[PDB]
Amino acid sequence: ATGGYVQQATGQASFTMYSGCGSPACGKAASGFTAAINQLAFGSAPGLGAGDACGRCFALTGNHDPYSPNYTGPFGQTIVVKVTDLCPVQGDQEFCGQTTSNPTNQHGMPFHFDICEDTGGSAKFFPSGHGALTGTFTEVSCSQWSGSDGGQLWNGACLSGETAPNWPSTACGNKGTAPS
């Protein structure tokens, strides 16, 4: 996409959970299930505002635990998240370090969703004892997402991807150039 960001409506991803998603990088939280997405897909960098992932809705499915490769299941439910947040490239190199020159993480995945625990998404998705998974995602209409957006936390906040057609398309827009 613009900026060299890798923004595909469907693909393979890794998955983790995180806490404290009430002041996320898009500048609006939401009451439904939410996630952070890796920087290369988010479409912005820390401090540069919302990227084009902001507000888009995705159906996530886990089907492997790379840390317990003999575990056969059960996995969790497929859930629909709204992306509200950035999983930065400069932080966790295991999961969100994808760049334009090296577009997969340490699990070989080109995308990562960090699912916010606070509002219930991770309890639907991760079986007890299996908090890091790999699997798939597909962008869906936000008609498939229960929830209400929070208020703007700063000027420029954006979740306008919530009404956009699936990628390829533009809503909030990408900021600067993707990490190399």
Q: How far apart, in whole angstroms, are the C-alpha atoms of residue 46 and residue 70?
A: 37
SS3 57: strand
Tokens (6 digits) for 140 = 């869906």
SS3 87: strand
Q: Which residues of 123-142 are buried (b: 16+ CB within 10 A; e: fewer)?
A: eebbeeebbbbbbbbbbbeb
Q: How far apart, in whole angstroms, are the C-alpha atoms of residue 152 and residue 141?
A: 22
Interacting positions 31-50 with ligand CC(CCO)CCO (CB under 6 A): 31
Q: Which residues pair with 60 in a beta bridge?
A: 79, 137
- Nearest residue (CB) to ligand CC(CCO)CCO, 102 versus 146: 146
DSSP state at residue 154: S
Q: Which of 1, 6, 29, 45 lies at the binding interface for ligand CC(CCO)CCO (CB under 6 A)? A: 29
Q: Does 4 bind ligand CC(CCO)CCO (CB under 6 A)?
A: no
Smallest separation (angstroms) from ligand CC(CCO)CCO to the CB of 6: 28
Q: Does 127 bind ligand CC(CCO)CCO (CB under 6 A)?
A: yes
Q: Alpha-carbon Rg of the chain, whole angstroms?
A: 15
DSSP state at residue 123: H
Structural contact between residues 61 and 112, judged by C-beta atoms closer than 8 angstroms: no
Interacting positions 88-117 with ligand CC(CCO)CCO (CB under 6 A): none
What x-and-dash track marks residues 148-167 binding ligand CC(CCO)CCO by CB under 6 A? x-x-----------------
- Nearest residue (CB) to ligand CC(CCO)CCO, 29 versus 171: 29
Q: Does 62 bind ligand CC(CCO)CCO (CB under 6 A)?
A: no
Residues that bind ligand CC(CCO)CCO (CB under 6 A): 22, 29-31, 70, 74, 76-77, 119, 124, 126-127, 148, 150
